[PDB]
């Protein structure tokens, strides 16, 4: 059956027919919906072959050469390579297609209007932690681009039958240290406690600030991970200040410009890429609301509210909501002042809406995770709140994977 | 671990398993291929009734700790006999009270369920005219409103009968503002209520022309055309909205009623279907201040308020929507507080729902919850529910949606 999808602000209706191309089951069953869960409980030739035929068919269709000679000779190659090695390799152009399709298909991403514009670095000729680091520095410098950020992915070597994975231990290329203190509390970023402690275990000298940029633990197959410190001039950071509130700057708050995920797995045509770091630019709510205001992140709300002299003693003064708004404004202002790319949650979701329309004409649907797509302040003040969404798994995909340790 | 969904809170790092979902005897709209949890409305008796009935009666006896008893098996026999010979059956009084509370308890879209055990149940199963429905409704509103100190209540009209037509309240709520369609194509009042306004008029209501005219009730007794009834203005408590520091906000003439009372839902118990059974609580302040006032397709006042606040409305990145919504929300709380009318802010409320989650975990092993509806429409991740995973599934008794009577 094809689901009927309504926008409640406008009374408009479409049908999702794309969802019929899902070959992978999600977590819901008719007895119970599990769609607000972050993770899956879950976490041979014939089947690799079919995902591979499917994907190649996807690529030749994409360049409008379906059923051509080049298409059939390419299905033959793949057939022949699997048949004798139990695996195959992608052509650079195909990889480029798969990476953009994997972004296109990511249901938790509100930035997909950008999906066609992705700089793809091929790093499948990497054989050491050393090389990885080199590739990673070039990715950072390219993506950062003096504040004029540009989407990029760098694809390290695929997983292989015999052997350890290429991995980046860090969850992001830039992350702040979180230091567990004696009295139970955390200095710095509570989300990075464990990865901070792993870096110390492998011989990093720690700092003691709240914004110490972490080193990278890079691991080549079956080897101990290796520590690399990023050169400080490569990690663009943005000092936080407020348009009108003068003391805010005094707070010493800052955030880094580049959001680059480095622990997710990229799957294309049955092949898996355990190290394939990707980056775009931040939506300000990610920093203003979640990273600074989550109670299990930097948890700055009370501090800000007090500074604003708000009545902290009760929920009904709405001091939480008042402070959160200024912290998001301070993030937008500061990024705009330091000429670094940022998108607010209204502009972002408005363009997500455009993307839904585009996909509806292009593909007959768009898989989307409503809980992730709707922003964390002002949900119903943005258009996506009012938009129904069908969520499902298409391939190429980005997946989660276990932590290497 | 156990083969029941694992459920995680990402703020505290705590885990539970929902086993309650095992008791669900009704499929929702999702399947392994695609999740449909975000649709408001997905999709659209004989031997079926009996087993729905048996199930309910079994729940009733458990709740009183008499499962397996003689009174329990006799009740079962009594229900079987009745359906054997009439196609239907009837609930004992305390069975209705249990079921009505259990239906509120089961409703995945209600954040207010810490309150589920406290519900005044008005048995109106004797009611036999639209005039009488009106008396009952008025009694409900008086009781529920209690001069500002609101009280949860439900009034249950007679059940669907096979061969006879339904009791039906046409209004979606007991209290609703009119929406008048203009010549320029805009709406004055509440655009949500454009259809029910035009039906009131067709049935001979003489209409007003304000932004906040209280609609009359269109009430339908079995097999009769519906009849029109005007609520006496002294029974509809309203709160004029002001802001604690922005002195001009009172000048906008915004107002809202005290009593949220849903009147178009179907209460199903044991297979029996109560098509008219309006229930009411008190508001969480975001329903008024954020949805009713700021939705683009409702009163849509965000721009007006931001202009008064002298915000830059020509650019998204000034967060003018965000600042104005906050203030409108503070104004809803401030004004209900001053007027001594019960209201709860979205912080207080979501907290009490986390408590309710923990109570239900112990009592029943889980709690059906609709995340998109539980999370408030401003300040989501500032409330603890945002960080709580939730399992959604259908349990009976239940409030269900039903097709509009026209
Ligand atoms: C163009 C700038 C981009 C913006 C503004 C953007 C926006 C976002 C946001 C707000 C999230 C939710 C993040 C969170 O709550 O942790 C997200 C998730 C995601 N995005 Fe993007 N995105 C951008 C570019 C990209 C690119 C280049 C890729 C991949 C090539 C990508 C793939 C993903 C994926 C796979 C997720 C889900 C991550 C997860 O499950 O943790 N996005 N995006
Ligand atoms: C005591 C104070 C209560 C509060 C604060 C409250 C809160 C809420 C809220 C905020 C909603 C969502 C409203 C919307 O977005 O349309 C809701 C929905 C709902 N509540 Fe409550 N509730 C309360 C009492 C009740 C009572 C007494 C009942 C019935 C006995 C009830 C049953 C329901 C049901 C069935 C829905 C879903 C309505 C729909 O899907 O259209 N609640 N509740
Ligand atoms: C590409 C991109 C653009 C942009 N604007 N923002 C992002 C940020 O994405 C993330 C930020 N922080 C964390 C994540 C990863 N979260 C995965 C959920 C998860 C799974 C398993 C364990 C766990 F602790 C957490 C992604 C990424
Ligand atoms: C009891 C109660 C307490 C409280 N605080 N708030 C409420 C508010 O409940 C509602 C408010 N506004 C609208 C509704 C009705 N929602 C119906 C959604 C819908 C739309 C279209 C078709 C359909 F079948 C169903 C309920 C009810
Ligand atoms: C439990 C819940 O699903 C979880 O908190 C989700 C909600 N929505 C989200 N949305 C985004 N973009 N990112 C998140 O981390 C989350 N967290
Ligand atoms: C499309 C989406 O399902 C819809 O806008 C929902 C979102 N969450 C909601 N939550 C509540 N409480 N009330 C609503 O009307 C809605 N609307
Ligand atoms: Zn689902």
mmCIF file of C-alpha atoms in Angstrom, chain B residues 36-316:
data_model
loop_
_atom_site.group_PDB
_atom_site.id
_atom_site.type_symbol
_atom_site.label_atom_id
_atom_site.label_comp_id
_atom_site.label_asym_id
_atom_site.label_seq_id
_atom_site.Cartn_x
_atom_site.Cartn_y
_atom_site.Cartn_z
ATOM 1 C CA UNK B 36 4.147 6.030 9.827
ATOM 2 C CA UNK B 37 4.315 7.253 13.432
ATOM 3 C CA UNK B 38 4.121 10.875 12.372
ATOM 4 C CA UNK B 39 0.728 10.768 10.574
ATOM 5 C CA UNK B 40 -2.139 12.312 12.533
ATOM 6 C CA UNK B 41 -4.655 9.962 10.918
ATOM 7 C CA UNK B 42 -3.337 6.847 9.241
ATOM 8 C CA UNK B 43 -5.868 4.871 7.114
ATOM 9 C CA UNK B 44 -9.669 5.455 6.851
ATOM 10 C CA UNK B 45 -20.600 -7.581 15.147
ATOM 11 C CA UNK B 46 -21.144 -11.045 16.801
ATOM 12 C CA UNK B 47 -18.198 -13.294 17.831
ATOM 13 C CA UNK B 48 -15.746 -10.369 17.678
ATOM 14 C CA UNK B 49 -17.727 -8.457 20.384
ATOM 15 C CA UNK B 50 -17.684 -11.300 22.825
ATOM 16 C CA UNK B 51 -13.925 -11.672 22.923
ATOM 17 C CA UNK B 52 -13.421 -7.912 23.161
ATOM 18 C CA UNK B 53 -15.972 -8.036 26.027
ATOM 19 C CA UNK B 54 -14.299 -10.995 27.786
ATOM 20 C CA UNK B 55 -11.039 -9.128 27.622
ATOM 21 C CA UNK B 56 -12.450 -6.005 29.192
ATOM 22 C CA UNK B 57 -14.272 -7.935 31.962
ATOM 23 C CA UNK B 58 -10.962 -9.750 32.678
ATOM 24 C CA UNK B 59 -9.220 -6.334 33.028
ATOM 25 C CA UNK B 60 -11.964 -5.147 35.387
ATOM 26 C CA UNK B 61 -11.641 -8.140 37.671
ATOM 27 C CA UNK B 62 -7.807 -7.842 37.744
ATOM 28 C CA UNK B 63 -8.044 -4.200 38.707
ATOM 29 C CA UNK B 64 -10.197 -5.255 41.679
ATOM 30 C CA UNK B 65 -7.965 -8.338 42.355
ATOM 31 C CA UNK B 66 -10.677 -10.935 41.770
ATOM 32 C CA UNK B 67 -9.376 -12.679 38.677
ATOM 33 C CA UNK B 68 -10.575 -16.291 38.574
ATOM 34 C CA UNK B 69 -13.234 -15.685 41.227
ATOM 35 C CA UNK B 70 -16.855 -16.796 41.221
ATOM 36 C CA UNK B 71 -18.152 -13.222 40.720
ATOM 37 C CA UNK B 72 -15.720 -12.939 37.809
ATOM 38 C CA UNK B 73 -16.868 -16.140 36.029
ATOM 39 C CA UNK B 74 -20.549 -15.288 36.664
ATOM 40 C CA UNK B 75 -20.074 -11.826 35.156
ATOM 41 C CA UNK B 76 -18.483 -13.530 32.124
ATOM 42 C CA UNK B 77 -21.501 -15.865 31.857
ATOM 43 C CA UNK B 78 -23.852 -12.891 32.284
ATOM 44 C CA UNK B 79 -22.144 -10.982 29.437
ATOM 45 C CA UNK B 80 -22.186 -14.108 27.132
ATOM 46 C CA UNK B 81 -25.896 -14.685 27.814
ATOM 47 C CA UNK B 82 -26.785 -11.069 27.051
ATOM 48 C CA UNK B 83 -24.963 -11.121 23.698
ATOM 49 C CA UNK B 84 -26.392 -14.586 23.020
ATOM 50 C CA UNK B 85 -29.819 -12.952 22.915
ATOM 51 C CA UNK B 86 -29.555 -9.224 22.018
ATOM 52 C CA UNK B 87 -26.365 -8.865 19.955
ATOM 53 C CA UNK B 88 -25.094 -6.448 22.639
ATOM 54 C CA UNK B 89 -24.523 -6.028 26.403
ATOM 55 C CA UNK B 90 -24.341 -3.338 29.120
ATOM 56 C CA UNK B 91 -21.666 -2.264 31.601
ATOM 57 C CA UNK B 92 -22.245 -2.091 35.316
ATOM 58 C CA UNK B 93 -21.698 1.397 36.681
ATOM 59 C CA UNK B 94 -18.265 0.733 38.223
ATOM 60 C CA UNK B 95 -17.254 -1.062 35.011
ATOM 61 C CA UNK B 96 -17.934 2.180 33.092
ATOM 62 C CA UNK B 97 -15.921 4.253 35.638
ATOM 63 C CA UNK B 98 -12.992 1.805 35.366
ATOM 64 C CA UNK B 99 -13.090 1.761 31.588
ATOM 65 C CA UNK B 100 -13.357 5.483 31.103
ATOM 66 C CA UNK B 101 -10.277 5.974 33.354
ATOM 67 C CA UNK B 102 -8.529 3.141 31.562
ATOM 68 C CA UNK B 103 -9.196 4.800 28.202
ATOM 69 C CA UNK B 104 -7.565 8.032 29.407
ATOM 70 C CA UNK B 105 -4.780 5.890 30.810
ATOM 71 C CA UNK B 106 -4.318 4.199 27.393
ATOM 72 C CA UNK B 107 -4.270 7.411 25.198
ATOM 73 C CA UNK B 108 -0.749 7.757 23.687
ATOM 74 C CA UNK B 109 -1.209 11.436 22.795
ATOM 75 C CA UNK B 110 -1.973 12.754 26.264
ATOM 76 C CA UNK B 111 0.819 14.245 28.355
ATOM 77 C CA UNK B 112 -1.680 14.802 31.168
ATOM 78 C CA UNK B 113 -1.895 11.170 32.300
ATOM 79 C CA UNK B 114 -0.251 11.630 35.773
ATOM 80 C CA UNK B 115 -3.852 12.674 36.482
ATOM 81 C CA UNK B 116 -5.556 9.530 35.099
ATOM 82 C CA UNK B 117 -6.729 8.132 38.466
ATOM 83 C CA UNK B 118 -8.660 11.309 39.193
ATOM 84 C CA UNK B 119 -11.584 11.582 36.800
ATOM 85 C CA UNK B 120 -15.180 12.421 37.594
ATOM 86 C CA UNK B 121 -17.356 10.074 35.511
ATOM 87 C CA UNK B 122 -20.912 11.258 34.849
ATOM 88 C CA UNK B 123 -23.084 8.405 33.851
ATOM 89 C CA UNK B 124 -25.512 9.834 31.270
ATOM 90 C CA UNK B 125 -26.595 6.509 29.785
ATOM 91 C CA UNK B 126 -30.261 7.305 30.563
ATOM 92 C CA UNK B 127 -30.283 10.403 28.360
ATOM 93 C CA UNK B 128 -32.999 10.335 25.671
ATOM 94 C CA UNK B 129 -33.287 13.738 23.973
ATOM 95 C CA UNK B 130 -31.033 16.403 22.497
ATOM 96 C CA UNK B 131 -32.540 18.732 25.153
ATOM 97 C CA UNK B 132 -31.286 16.366 27.852
ATOM 98 C CA UNK B 133 -27.835 16.133 26.245
ATOM 99 C CA UNK B 134 -27.753 19.910 26.636
ATOM 100 C CA UNK B 135 -28.607 19.713 30.338
ATOM 101 C CA UNK B 136 -25.923 17.074 30.905
ATOM 102 C CA UNK B 137 -23.342 19.085 28.960
ATOM 103 C CA UNK B 138 -24.105 22.210 31.009
ATOM 104 C CA UNK B 139 -23.822 20.273 34.249
ATOM 105 C CA UNK B 140 -20.463 18.947 33.025
ATOM 106 C CA UNK B 141 -19.122 22.445 32.217
ATOM 107 C CA UNK B 142 -20.291 23.871 35.586
ATOM 108 C CA UNK B 143 -18.732 20.997 37.495
ATOM 109 C CA UNK B 144 -15.544 20.812 35.415
ATOM 110 C CA UNK B 145 -14.979 24.610 35.488
ATOM 111 C CA UNK B 146 -15.554 24.932 39.211
ATOM 112 C CA UNK B 147 -15.021 28.707 39.021
ATOM 113 C CA UNK B 148 -11.376 28.409 37.898
ATOM 114 C CA UNK B 149 -10.284 25.404 39.958
ATOM 115 C CA UNK B 150 -10.726 22.952 37.049
ATOM 116 C CA UNK B 151 -11.617 19.287 37.493
ATOM 117 C CA UNK B 152 -11.224 16.369 35.014
ATOM 118 C CA UNK B 153 -14.527 14.957 33.986
ATOM 119 C CA UNK B 154 -16.283 12.897 31.356
ATOM 120 C CA UNK B 155 -19.971 12.509 30.630
ATOM 121 C CA UNK B 156 -20.971 9.241 28.933
ATOM 122 C CA UNK B 157 -24.080 9.280 26.735
ATOM 123 C CA UNK B 158 -25.828 6.118 25.573
ATOM 124 C CA UNK B 159 -23.873 3.539 23.557
ATOM 125 C CA UNK B 160 -24.217 2.767 19.860
ATOM 126 C CA UNK B 161 -27.162 0.360 19.370
ATOM 127 C CA UNK B 162 -27.699 -1.944 16.522
ATOM 128 C CA UNK B 163 -30.538 -0.560 14.382
ATOM 129 C CA UNK B 164 -30.966 2.784 16.198
ATOM 130 C CA UNK B 165 -28.960 5.903 15.205
ATOM 131 C CA UNK B 166 -26.072 7.404 17.289
ATOM 132 C CA UNK B 167 -25.884 10.056 19.968
ATOM 133 C CA UNK B 168 -23.514 12.617 18.459
ATOM 134 C CA UNK B 169 -22.091 15.962 19.413
ATOM 135 C CA UNK B 170 -21.285 17.791 16.144
ATOM 136 C CA UNK B 171 -18.785 20.237 17.721
ATOM 137 C CA UNK B 172 -15.205 18.960 18.020
ATOM 138 C CA UNK B 173 -15.017 20.745 21.425
ATOM 139 C CA UNK B 174 -17.609 21.987 23.914
ATOM 140 C CA UNK B 175 -16.093 25.426 23.653
ATOM 141 C CA UNK B 176 -14.790 26.716 20.291
ATOM 142 C CA UNK B 177 -14.589 30.097 18.573
ATOM 143 C CA UNK B 178 -16.344 30.771 15.259
ATOM 144 C CA UNK B 179 -14.422 31.245 12.035
ATOM 145 C CA UNK B 180 -16.118 33.415 9.464
ATOM 146 C CA UNK B 181 -15.068 33.148 5.834
ATOM 147 C CA UNK B 182 -14.717 36.660 4.324
ATOM 148 C CA UNK B 183 -15.054 37.925 0.742
ATOM 149 C CA UNK B 184 -11.291 38.581 0.515
ATOM 150 C CA UNK B 185 -10.822 34.852 1.270
ATOM 151 C CA UNK B 186 -9.366 35.383 4.759
ATOM 152 C CA UNK B 187 -11.017 34.081 7.948
ATOM 153 C CA UNK B 188 -12.150 36.070 10.961
ATOM 154 C CA UNK B 189 -11.970 34.083 14.177
ATOM 155 C CA UNK B 190 -10.574 30.577 14.244
ATOM 156 C CA UNK B 191 -9.941 28.968 10.835
ATOM 157 C CA UNK B 192 -10.051 25.546 12.451
ATOM 158 C CA UNK B 193 -13.800 25.986 12.864
ATOM 159 C CA UNK B 194 -14.908 27.176 9.469
ATOM 160 C CA UNK B 195 -17.006 24.103 8.654
ATOM 161 C CA UNK B 196 -18.745 23.851 12.037
ATOM 162 C CA UNK B 197 -19.477 27.545 11.868
ATOM 163 C CA UNK B 198 -21.198 27.166 8.458
ATOM 164 C CA UNK B 199 -23.196 24.205 9.815
ATOM 165 C CA UNK B 200 -24.359 26.147 12.856
ATOM 166 C CA UNK B 201 -25.607 28.864 10.485
ATOM 167 C CA UNK B 202 -27.388 26.395 8.127
ATOM 168 C CA UNK B 203 -29.216 25.063 11.168
ATOM 169 C CA UNK B 204 -30.427 28.574 12.005
ATOM 170 C CA UNK B 205 -27.758 30.098 14.234
ATOM 171 C CA UNK B 206 -27.654 33.837 13.972
ATOM 172 C CA UNK B 207 -23.952 34.547 13.605
ATOM 173 C CA UNK B 208 -21.732 37.245 15.204
ATOM 174 C CA UNK B 209 -18.675 38.962 13.639
ATOM 175 C CA UNK B 210 -15.898 38.902 16.282
ATOM 176 C CA UNK B 211 -12.590 37.072 16.458
ATOM 177 C CA UNK B 212 -13.773 35.197 19.594
ATOM 178 C CA UNK B 213 -17.526 34.327 19.293
ATOM 179 C CA UNK B 214 -18.379 31.158 21.237
ATOM 180 C CA UNK B 215 -20.075 28.609 18.962
ATOM 181 C CA UNK B 216 -23.379 27.020 19.881
ATOM 182 C CA UNK B 217 -23.681 23.272 20.307
ATOM 183 C CA UNK B 218 -25.128 21.141 17.595
ATOM 184 C CA UNK B 219 -26.550 18.057 19.362
ATOM 185 C CA UNK B 220 -27.924 14.940 17.738
ATOM 186 C CA UNK B 221 -30.100 12.402 19.513
ATOM 187 C CA UNK B 222 -30.846 9.028 17.743
ATOM 188 C CA UNK B 223 -32.365 9.287 14.244
ATOM 189 C CA UNK B 224 -33.161 12.997 14.557
ATOM 190 C CA UNK B 225 -31.705 15.968 12.746
ATOM 191 C CA UNK B 226 -29.392 17.792 15.177
ATOM 192 C CA UNK B 227 -30.679 20.636 17.358
ATOM 193 C CA UNK B 228 -28.972 23.878 18.229
ATOM 194 C CA UNK B 229 -28.121 25.058 21.749
ATOM 195 C CA UNK B 230 -26.471 28.282 22.936
ATOM 196 C CA UNK B 231 -24.276 28.070 25.998
ATOM 197 C CA UNK B 232 -25.237 30.728 28.550
ATOM 198 C CA UNK B 233 -22.223 33.108 28.601
ATOM 199 C CA UNK B 234 -21.903 32.820 32.403
ATOM 200 C CA UNK B 235 -21.001 29.144 32.010
ATOM 201 C CA UNK B 236 -18.094 29.672 29.615
ATOM 202 C CA UNK B 237 -15.180 30.976 31.696
ATOM 203 C CA UNK B 238 -12.710 32.999 29.628
ATOM 204 C CA UNK B 239 -9.312 34.578 30.350
ATOM 205 C CA UNK B 240 -8.313 37.919 28.755
ATOM 206 C CA UNK B 241 -4.657 37.798 27.863
ATOM 207 C CA UNK B 242 -2.105 40.273 29.200
ATOM 208 C CA UNK B 243 1.639 40.207 29.470
ATOM 209 C CA UNK B 244 3.473 40.762 32.812
ATOM 210 C CA UNK B 245 5.784 43.539 31.492
ATOM 211 C CA UNK B 246 4.716 44.415 27.941
ATOM 212 C CA UNK B 247 1.842 46.732 28.734
ATOM 213 C CA UNK B 248 0.585 46.894 25.143
ATOM 214 C CA UNK B 249 -0.172 43.147 24.952
ATOM 215 C CA UNK B 250 -3.509 43.592 26.786
ATOM 216 C CA UNK B 251 -4.456 46.104 24.079
ATOM 217 C CA UNK B 252 -4.488 43.250 21.474
ATOM 218 C CA UNK B 253 -7.795 41.900 22.850
ATOM 219 C CA UNK B 254 -6.651 38.289 22.722
ATOM 220 C CA UNK B 255 -8.515 35.819 24.938
ATOM 221 C CA UNK B 256 -8.991 32.066 25.407
ATOM 222 C CA UNK B 257 -11.448 29.828 27.212
ATOM 223 C CA UNK B 258 -10.593 27.886 30.345
ATOM 224 C CA UNK B 259 -12.055 24.500 29.468
ATOM 225 C CA UNK B 260 -10.597 22.151 26.993
ATOM 226 C CA UNK B 261 -13.322 19.627 26.363
ATOM 227 C CA UNK B 262 -13.078 17.157 23.481
ATOM 228 C CA UNK B 263 -16.480 16.204 22.285
ATOM 229 C CA UNK B 264 -16.091 14.372 19.011
ATOM 230 C CA UNK B 265 -14.142 11.302 20.109
ATOM 231 C CA UNK B 266 -15.442 7.740 20.430
ATOM 232 C CA UNK B 267 -14.921 5.944 23.739
ATOM 233 C CA UNK B 268 -14.675 2.207 23.137
ATOM 234 C CA UNK B 269 -14.982 -0.232 26.040
ATOM 235 C CA UNK B 270 -15.265 -4.046 25.712
ATOM 236 C CA UNK B 271 -16.400 -3.658 22.129
ATOM 237 C CA UNK B 272 -19.174 -1.247 23.203
ATOM 238 C CA UNK B 273 -18.918 2.144 21.478
ATOM 239 C CA UNK B 274 -19.871 5.409 23.140
ATOM 240 C CA UNK B 275 -20.121 7.885 20.248
ATOM 241 C CA UNK B 276 -20.918 10.809 22.517
ATOM 242 C CA UNK B 277 -18.709 10.995 25.634
ATOM 243 C CA UNK B 278 -17.099 14.406 25.959
ATOM 244 C CA UNK B 279 -14.157 14.725 28.370
ATOM 245 C CA UNK B 280 -12.173 17.689 29.689
ATOM 246 C CA UNK B 281 -9.109 18.626 31.774
ATOM 247 C CA UNK B 282 -7.108 21.804 32.005
ATOM 248 C CA UNK B 283 -4.774 23.267 29.341
ATOM 249 C CA UNK B 284 -1.030 23.058 29.073
ATOM 250 C CA UNK B 285 -0.055 26.567 28.203
ATOM 251 C CA UNK B 286 1.636 25.673 24.870
ATOM 252 C CA UNK B 287 -1.753 24.519 23.432
ATOM 253 C CA UNK B 288 -2.990 28.111 23.581
ATOM 254 C CA UNK B 289 0.115 30.201 23.378
ATOM 255 C CA UNK B 290 1.924 28.259 20.739
ATOM 256 C CA UNK B 291 -0.566 26.240 18.685
ATOM 257 C CA UNK B 292 -3.923 28.024 18.814
ATOM 258 C CA UNK B 293 -2.485 31.531 18.643
ATOM 259 C CA UNK B 294 0.656 31.004 16.458
ATOM 260 C CA UNK B 295 -0.109 28.183 13.993
ATOM 261 C CA UNK B 296 -0.012 29.613 10.477
ATOM 262 C CA UNK B 297 -3.462 28.049 9.861
ATOM 263 C CA UNK B 298 -4.976 29.168 13.148
ATOM 264 C CA UNK B 299 -4.948 32.725 14.548
ATOM 265 C CA UNK B 300 -1.417 33.250 13.180
ATOM 266 C CA UNK B 301 -0.506 36.216 15.434
ATOM 267 C CA UNK B 302 3.290 35.790 15.490
ATOM 268 C CA UNK B 303 4.052 38.571 12.983
ATOM 269 C CA UNK B 304 1.681 41.085 14.660
ATOM 270 C CA UNK B 305 3.252 40.406 18.046
ATOM 271 C CA UNK B 306 6.785 40.604 16.687
ATOM 272 C CA UNK B 307 6.012 43.976 15.067
ATOM 273 C CA UNK B 308 4.753 45.333 18.463
ATOM 274 C CA UNK B 309 7.967 43.937 19.947
ATOM 275 C CA UNK B 310 9.867 45.810 17.212
ATOM 276 C CA UNK B 311 11.798 42.730 16.075
ATOM 277 C CA UNK B 312 13.325 42.427 12.593
ATOM 278 C CA UNK B 313 10.677 40.415 10.709
ATOM 279 C CA UNK B 314 12.385 40.520 7.272
ATOM 280 C CA UNK B 315 15.004 37.908 8.216
ATOM 281 C CA UNK B 316 14.703 34.428 9.736
#
